[PDB]
Design a protein around this ligand. Structure first.
Ligand SMILES: N[C@@H](Cc1ccc(O)c([N+](=O)[O-])c1)C(=O)O
Ligand SMILES: N[C@@H](Cc1ccc(O)c([N+](=O)[O-])c1)C(=O)O
Ligand code: NA
Ligand code: NA
Lengths: 312, 312
């Protein structure tokens, strides 16, 4: 498995593979992702940081944009408070092992030259296109604000202004990114990560829907959340427990089971696990027990580095 | 006729008269109007400059905003070219006798603090409200751009940032101004001037519709435009020739007529003229002849000051 395949593993799409292969040849290459600061950092965040770590191991310089001004435009509160949550998010990302440079959007997004570029992009971007690009990002609002359509053209310009070769985000970002590839003179390579399902199966995982596992959740909290989660026997699509097994667990995986239910089970890949589960040879309760315990172990170093700050 | 009545003469509305009366007491008071730079300066412009002259004679300091960045957002071209047309407009306004200070929007509208205020207003302004406020201003576009809804919140902030007591414009501006009175901490007094009808009677006078008299039109051009204009006998509403008589001509007015059509006629007010015209005692051709000749005389000093620049 080469650098390209390491980077591609567990992504939903790369726009485009040819372009990424051209980028990989260079000595100096940079990748960025932006996050609206979030009160809790969850598995969806961690999935994306893992991908940034992959890029870093492939020789990319990594920039994490703490997207305070975007969050402001998307009604997350006052800038100063948003920034404070951004600094907390930085500490969490650092506790995940990421080696990166961190920047706050507002440090450069209010510059005269940046704003003139935003207004130039505003002339090229239809309202209808801008609204469509925000459908999976915008805060729910019965009376959508002008701020909602400034946000996407802020994010288009972000990638241009900073000279990144690669932009990374979730599939929710893909329409903004396709606008960026259409309007900017240098085409940014876009790597999109899958969107995790919420624990109750009812929609996508998100910080505002309370349907997530946070990286610093206690072991007892993780077990409780997994025990209650949607996980129907034999169904893999939209199954959040199988998603965690695919995206976070290491293989070969040993699933402990009582002898009366078949005894311990060693699975050499996620793909073998999917077969066992679809063929009803693995029961949800046993999948859940293994996923909970292996996830606790995966997150333990992150939680204890954040716990050391308090001191024990 | 006091200062308040001089200011009110020939306006469509003052929001509000009480507030204007409070402003009139102060020693230091300022009024501004903004114009997207226009290749031709026409009677609609002149109507508004006349009102600014009224304010100046009432002790207001006058600021003329050459609204280059607004024009840019409203698809009038590149900033540098727009600015050049702005400097031409300044020379025309100066040739009208206005004593004022001139500022280009872009000189202050790209400042960090200005932009942060725009984004704060964008959070308070619905898309639906912003689009409604632009219906009579926005350039025709089958695919309206994000720039269209940035424009109104640029103009709201303009009045705030510069600390004007009074904003002046045409009735087309009134929805943006009512947004400004609703969102800003200091309520700006708004003076709205009527919108002139186009020469062919079919819509409002505007630079893009080629339905105007320009202040530097030749005498032969003015006569030709008036001769062809909509002017039905006995009808005053939507009659552009009667509008010119109301808003530009001085009274008492002597209308020269052949003896066979009643001989010369002296009218002591626009209101007496309206009665004569509605009662079919004054024929369109004779109204047109008087309006053309008195308008030529009114504009002659403006045209010859602009002609002196060439040199004769
Ligand atoms: N859209 C991202 C935030 C973001 C990503 C990348 C960006 O460049 C910017 N930005 O420019 O403000 C913002 C989110 O949903 O969290
Ligand atoms: N809306 C005006 C132009 C204008 C007036 C006042 C203003 O403050 C600004 N502005 O802020 O750019 C622009 C027009 O139709 O010509
Ligand atoms: Na090298
Ligand atoms: Na005094």
């Amino acid at each position: 498995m080469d650098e390209f395949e390491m980077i591609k593993r567990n992504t939903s799409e790369i726009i485009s593979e040819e372009e990424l292969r051209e980028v990989l040849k260079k000595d100096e290459k940079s990748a960025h992702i932006g996050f609206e600061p979030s009160g809790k950092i969850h598995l969806g965040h961690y999935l994306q940081i893992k991908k940034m770590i992959d890029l870093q191991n492939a020789g990319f310089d990594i920039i994490i944009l703490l997207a305070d001004l975007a969050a402001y435009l998307n009604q997350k509160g006052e800038l100063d408070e948003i920034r404070k949550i951004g600094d907390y998010n930085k500490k969490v990302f650092e506790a995940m092992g990421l080696k990166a440079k961190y920047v706050y959007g507002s440090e450069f997004q209010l510059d005269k030259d940046y704003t003139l570029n935003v207004y130039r992009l505003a002339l090229k971007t239809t309202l209808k296109r801008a609204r469509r690009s925000m459908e999976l990002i915008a805060r729910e609002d019965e009376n959508p604000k002008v701020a909602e359509v400034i946000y996407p053209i802020m994010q288009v310009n972000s990638a241009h202004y900073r000279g990144v070769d690669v932009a990374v985000g979730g599939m929710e970002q893909r329409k903004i990114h396709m606008l960026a590839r259409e309007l900017l003179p240098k085409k940014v390579v876009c790597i999109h990560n899958p969107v995790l399902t919420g624990l109750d199966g009812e929609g996508k995982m998100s910080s505002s829907k309370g349907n997530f596992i946070a990286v610093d959740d206690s072991p007892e909290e993780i077990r409780a959340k997994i025990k209650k989660a949607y996980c129907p026997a034999g169904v893999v699509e939209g199954n959040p427990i199988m998603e965690i097994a695919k995206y976070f667990l290491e293989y070969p995986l040993t699933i402990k089971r009582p002898e009366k239910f078949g005894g311990d089970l060693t699975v050499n890949s996620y793909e073998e696990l999917e077969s066992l589960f679809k063929n009803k040879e693995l029961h949800p309760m046993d999948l859940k027990n293994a996923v909970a315990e292996e996830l606790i172990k995966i997150l333990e170093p992150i939680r204890k580095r954040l716990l050391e700050h308090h001191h024990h």
